Symmetry: D2
Subunit: 318 residues, 4 copies
Amino acid sequence: THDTGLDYITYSDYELDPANPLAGGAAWIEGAFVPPSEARISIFDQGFYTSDATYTTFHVWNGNAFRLGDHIERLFSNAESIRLIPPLTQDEVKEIALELVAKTELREAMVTVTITRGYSSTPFERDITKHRPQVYMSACPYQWIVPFDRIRDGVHLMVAQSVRRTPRSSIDPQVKNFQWGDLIRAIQETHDRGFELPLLLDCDNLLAEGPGFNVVVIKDGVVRSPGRAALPGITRKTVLEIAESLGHEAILADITPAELYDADEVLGCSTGGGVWPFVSVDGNSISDGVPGPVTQSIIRRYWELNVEPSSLLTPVQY
Amino acid sequence: YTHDTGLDYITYSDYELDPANPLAGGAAWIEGAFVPPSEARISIFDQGFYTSDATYTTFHVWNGNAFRLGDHIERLFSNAESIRLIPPLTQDEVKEIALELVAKTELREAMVTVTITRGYSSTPFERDITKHRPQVYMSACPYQWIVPFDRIRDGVHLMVAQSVRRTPRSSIDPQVKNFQWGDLIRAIQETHDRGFELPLLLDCDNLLAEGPGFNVVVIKDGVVRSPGRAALPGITRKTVLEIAESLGHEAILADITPAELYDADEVLGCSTGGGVWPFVSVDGNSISDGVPGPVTQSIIRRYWELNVEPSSLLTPVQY
Amino acid sequence: EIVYTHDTGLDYITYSDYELDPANPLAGGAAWIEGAFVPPSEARISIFDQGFYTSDATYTTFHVWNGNAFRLGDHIERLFSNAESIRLIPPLTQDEVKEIALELVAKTELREAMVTVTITRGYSSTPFERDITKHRPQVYMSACPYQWIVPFDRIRDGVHLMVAQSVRRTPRSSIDPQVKNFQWGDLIRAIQETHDRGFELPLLLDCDNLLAEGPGFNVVVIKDGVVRSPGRAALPGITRKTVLEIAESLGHEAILADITPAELYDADEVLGCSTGGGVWPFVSVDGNSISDGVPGPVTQSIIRRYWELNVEPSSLLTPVQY
Amino acid sequence: EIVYTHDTGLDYITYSDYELDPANPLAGGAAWIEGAFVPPSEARISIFDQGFYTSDATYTTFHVWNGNAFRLGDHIERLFSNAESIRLIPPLTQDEVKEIALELVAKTELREAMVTVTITRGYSSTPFERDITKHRPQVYMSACPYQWIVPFDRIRDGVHLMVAQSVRRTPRSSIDPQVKNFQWGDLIRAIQETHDRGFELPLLLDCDNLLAEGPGFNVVVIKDGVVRSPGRAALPGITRKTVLEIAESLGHEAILADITPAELYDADEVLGCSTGGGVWPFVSVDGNSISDGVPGPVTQSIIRRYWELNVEPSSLLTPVQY
Ligand SMILES: *[C@@H](CC(=O)c1ccc(Br)cc1)c1c(COP(=O)([O-])[O-])cnc(C)c1O
Ligand SMILES: *[C@@H](CC(=O)c1ccc(Br)cc1)c1c(COP(=O)([O-])[O-])cnc(C)c1O
Ligand SMILES: *[C@@H](CC(=O)c1ccc(Br)cc1)c1c(COP(=O)([O-])[O-])cnc(C)c1O
Ligand SMILES: *[C@H](CC(=O)c1ccc(Br)cc1)c1c(COP(=O)([O-])[O-])cnc(C)c1O
């Protein structure tokens, strides 16, 4: 829990049971519910040594899971893209994940579901029937990519020059993955040059995405986000739906660096922190330099959707 | 842990594993402890897993001797430096621990992996770089063969991948050994679809790159060439080019076109995982007369001699 | 002997019935160069024009059918936009270009024609010029008989497509395909590969292995009643624009998108489009049949409607004053 | 009026002392087009030549200094090799090309000159021609006064380099930089960026973010006595070849290699080279000084030796018969 300093983001008023060994954090590994200190996987799992895996991360707020159906549908689609047959159904995954959160007692949480090729085979296996895929889960306190004061005041963005986003013809960014070699290089560049977060470009020098977040660009009342070298984010989807509710045209598109610098407003979005403003790029102010009014309406409406009763929410049974 | 090979130049050791030893035939070193394979586990909160923020190397032991251990650990530490990772052990400390690990398994023929990660005490968004706490993990297992023995003798059928290309140096550098195999796995899958044995990937410029776990070498008019850019600087590759120079051939790193691959006199593959083997066809097209060439055969034999003949390439394991 | 008409064997494509005046030295073909209307044999440019030796130029090609120019306004707007993208200031206005081009066609007496308008950086300057004010851009035009990228029997029966493997479309970060240009090094390589492998036309892929375009044409892919065409590594074609408008009028969702090779092979229908020939079907890819290997019904209705739009009085048509 | 000599301010570069005959209509500049020797104002080509509208062509540019052609054999060999790479069969032999080119220079009376030889696919066919035998390739030549990519004072004092960020060199998988070509879309963008950011010349990177080349020149990087130049995304320059030979003669290791931006910034010395100006220093990159910001000693000895090779009797020189 925290006091946020923002009227639209609150936190539950509760205390964790110290008699419960899973309280405040836990994992599900090979059929067992375990505490964080016992949450370990085999070094012989291909999910480690060939990163042969995909995943998704959903969140729980005030005791409700946000867009669980969308999340598990994306996970299973991503698994299909890499020819991975999950050993559980979508319904089974949902039930186990919700149970895991319940055992932690966490009302505000992050829940990761990972599917790997497993430890019963190697990448050179001739017989595809010999592969034995694994599912791993973890539930932890909600994590913030940017702090609360920066959600209010905005963040300073940098366009990376020493690295570009991996092409779809090598390792597809539309498949959520742990292969962050390029994304880590971008973070390191950000430390060197003295900025807060990086945005990468693609092979054609068009806007891609950042480490753990999508970017959105607002110009003359039109709301645009990168369609190609970017994860199809659930937060992004929500942002574009909100934009349409407010009477704006909202579309996926190819966006140039010139268009980024010349934008009315710019924002970032992710399951890990929700929505926040980007007020400058490479030290150049975006319209002056303070969070724009369309961005502010979007941020407020997003957090309303986390609490107002709808089909977007699934109650956790504690 | 042993085989009859059917080849005069590859011979396993004649011995038996002690069944009273719980580490016999396989073991790992994890967070200061020597453990059996079933207890060899790492934290899911290690960044080496969830951001693949790690590098590694794999060396081998043959007839009780580690092969080119110094070169291997030098490459590992160089790769760590390339990704700004400060190892928590020295090169000497790593060598001593790795050799002890093998000794405890009693394996005379083995594969030994040394991995360095960013660790589990921090996250990718950490503001203070001093807060990172890197980890070292090791494992020792029986020697593994990327191709079987009959195929080392008779040759392998290669495929040039069309649905995927090797990750560029401007995204994830192939010259840093890494676990980020998304492209390499796609290539293996394409090989199953099209009915071939192993794949070779191309780079962004449609020049020869490398394969999943191996380098490629191309021989034409007595000149021996291997890809210099989109390829790991292999220790086996290095040995192959040294052997070629010994035999009086010009041996160089270079940019190689697909046309040059199809028109080659000889083609071979190399890796710590299996040594050296011939590639006798590409996309169903024969390389020369479709049988292993004579320069390839001399290289294969000489490689295995170097694994047994007493030299500075060898380091004895104290069993 | 200039060929300027044909019997097509198709009820929806009909040439005009007329004769060229042999007393006219510009009849059947002509050019506009440095203020002068000239015959083809005198249609020459300076080797010192940067439009040649650095290919520092852009262009467009429109057509005339049964005495009417098709979508002239859209064509000249795209040309001027393409010029702006490469920082080239045209020495004529859009209106002036339209007037000169229409006159040129009139002088040829051609009722069915292809008209190319080219803008170059010129011959008064070099690429290393320090003072940008010293550049003196040039406009060149030519008008010729209508040309067909594919023959009439293939418009009816369909064409055999090949996906290129030895070459890829130049990236937007080097030479932008969204700017019409003469820099065809990649496209010519693709054509040569089609001769090697024994196919009729090539389709190139982009850096991400997504569908791009072909030499002188855009590609369109139809699946479960949805009509899609490549948005990135492709010229914003005027024929493409017309095809998508027609699809919407038939009640289909019609969009620009990123399209995979798997999707191409698994398509219900595939077609090609260009000013140079209109619209035609692609019935196989790499020797694999698309559906049952015959032109699909959505494609057929698009082809027929396209040619109807070339004759039915609309704002898409501009009459030539012969 | 025609400028054909200068006082250079440099002891190692000296023009010839002579006067052009004003009775000669080809004096000071001329071209060879379709079998005819013509003056610059009549030097024109057909707009229907594919060398224009599909840039389906390759070329080379050699120079003449103090009445001798420099490395003519190497130049014509590269030209014929480049033609072969794009499946273009030249309509003249290498000997015929040499003889015609030398005659052309002789007719201009120029002792210091630039000579361009171009081979195109021609005007007797189109890119869609089914029968390869129907292609009729053309050769075009021009001879002009020697041209300087950088002025004399900058050869002495050095040039300010910029690494381009808005554009990258066309990949070998689209349009090959190892085939000399007129397809300069990326190179022109780089020049434009140089005007925007306030620098003198640009250097482009390749797809892997490694050093490529510049517009009309190769780059060379010197570090701890080792001399290196980009091997992949770069023309195999004749000037580059000469520079590396000179480096070996001075006792330096001289090699083609993959070079990173970090290595460029950290270099002891950096230089540029081309037929169009010879050799010159690069003293800063993106406003950052290379070493102490003045031309390095290895660079200076290379520059001087290059110009010695242009005058000292050797097999590198072919005399023009005036
Ligand atoms: C390393 C691949 C291996 O080390 C390995 C080990 C066991 C097996 Br069954 C398969 C592969 C590798 C190389 C080889 O370089 P070196 O000879 O080990 O120094 C080459 N290229 C890639 C991409 C690799 O991963
Ligand atoms: C334009 C190509 C042509 O206009 C053309 C003209 C005549 C012939 Br015989 C062949 C080609 C082009 C397009 C499509 O242009 P639009 O649909 O007519 O506006 C698409 N892609 C490329 C690369 C082109 O050059
Ligand atoms: C060749 C460029 C030239 O030939 C040239 C001639 C005159 C002028 Br003012 C400018 C340029 C070129 C090279 C260098 O090749 P070489 O050393 O002359 O054999 C390198 N890279 C490119 C892209 C070129 O065009
Ligand atoms: C995944 C982002 C996360 O799941 C995540 C988890 C914890 C933290 Br502290 C930060 C981020 C991801 C996204 C997110 O899109 P979505 O809105 O969660 O669907 C976007 N882009 C990339 C590359 C990601 O990895």
